[PDB]
Amino acid sequence: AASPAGSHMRLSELASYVSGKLIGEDKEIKVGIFNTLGDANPNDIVIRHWIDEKGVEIAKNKEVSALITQNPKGNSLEYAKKLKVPIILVNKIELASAFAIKWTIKNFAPNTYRVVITGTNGKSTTTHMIYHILTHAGKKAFTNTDAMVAKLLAEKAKKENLEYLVIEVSEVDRLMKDHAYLMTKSINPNVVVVTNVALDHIGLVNSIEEVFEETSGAVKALEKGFAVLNYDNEFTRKMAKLTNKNVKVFFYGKNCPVTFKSGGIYVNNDLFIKKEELPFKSEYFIQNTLAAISACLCLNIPPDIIKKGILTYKPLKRRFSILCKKPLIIDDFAHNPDGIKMAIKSAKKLTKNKLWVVCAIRGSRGKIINKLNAESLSKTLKNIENYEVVITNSDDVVDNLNKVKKEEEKTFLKTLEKYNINYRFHKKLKTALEETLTNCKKDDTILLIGAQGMDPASKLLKKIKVIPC
Ligand SMILES: O=c1ccn([C@@H]2O[C@H](COP(=O)(O)OP(=O)(O)O)[C@@H](O)[C@H]2O)c(=O)[nH]1
DSSP states (O other): OOOOOSSEEEHHHHHHHTTEEEESOOOEEEOOOEEOTTTOOTTOEEEEEEEOHHHHHHHHHTTOSEEEEEEEOTTHHHHHHHHTOOEEEESOHHHHHHHHHHHHHHHHOTTOEEEEEEOSSSHHHHHHHHHHHHHHTTOOEEESOOOOHHHHHHHHHTTSOOOEEEEEOOOOOOOOTTHHHHHHHHHOOSEEEEOOOOOOHHHHHSOHHHHHHHHHHHHHTOSSSEEEEETTSHHHHHGGGGOOTTOEEEEESTTSSEEEETTEEEETTEEEEOGGGOTTOOHHHHHHHHHHHHHHHHTTOOHHHHHHHHHTOOOOTTSSEEEEETTEEEEEOOOSHHHHHHHHHHHHHTOSSOEEEEEEOOTTSOHHHHHHHHHHHHHHHHTOOSEEEEEEOOTTTOOGGGOOOHHHHHHHHHHHHHTTOOEEEESOHHHHHHHHHHHOOTTOEEEEEOSTTTTTHHHHHHHTTOSOO
């Protein structure tokens, strides 16, 4: 694959590399990195879906070497012609981003080992785990997840001699069927991890089959190496049929070489992580741990190093976080049907007595995700004894971008009563939490689930002096 090297480029060649048309005079340009308009340094190239006259002016003032865009708005084209700002007009802007990744890897981090992580849920945790295992061992690594890939990669590569790229690839506004394929092709990873496919907002706007097909593109992009696939998720299990000839399928999950059983994690039927080292863990946590171990075995990381990384991993925020032990308070950002199912089942597995499930409606996200989330909560609790559901709008703690609308609250509560689910409702999160805390027993379990509506829970629970217990 022909990717240019060096800090100089011909504008018409750049245009060809990104499948675009140069608007302006061809010339050789000095190139910095691919950046955003807001951070662009002189000679940087900016890829931006939309541009307007003010953007063109900013690009001129920042001495951007070239602007690549799909939608020049207003008179920006003629304005850029006036200001002599080179514009490359593309029909499919993701081709430019893919070129930027490939070029950035080649020019700033060519000798790296690379892993791509995709899936509906668990992407960020799994990426974070893999990244932590490597950096805990002293390896220099880049990841695009926080606790434009080309931009972030260049910035870190300019600061250290990277050995590993650990890149999370997401599903998308319009679901593009080749998004994961093209991004994975541009990274050329040794290992692709797929955590799961599940119903989320993109699947609802499109379909779960189109999300599965888009996700599987990351596996189809592999011509060598390892596809690390969650056996316990039917969609990712199916992608084993989609691997190319020389790609090794590496299943993790039940009856797989990396597996969780008898409370512990086993590798090739040898005990690897004892149950003593996995207290108060969720289903997703275990599955993500199996994925991260599998990825690192496929990178030939010595097992003692994997294990040290696993034992020192610090989870991301609101990943089944234990806020209190008596009562057991669990804070989880579960926000789509599969996440809510796993959170409740994992909470029930740890529940001595009564299970309290406090759930914040996903305000300003539509009726359908809320109906299905309420559906998942209902079906999951139907096979569970000794529970109580507290639904909240969190009107007291959410901003206007996350406010629960009238139709969203109705469909959520309508679904609950449709399934004979006994529930209490409260507009305020403070009231939902207080009523739960004043009515629960010391040996109960309180599971808090939700997105932005539940983010303020732990800070609120501190104001009412229930944590630290
Ligand atoms: O076509 C454009 C592109 C960018 N900007 C401004 O340039 C700044 C930086 O834009 P960038 O894409 O770097 O980050 P954003 O704010 O869009 O997330 C923003 O405050 C934008 O308002 C503008 O006025 N017109």
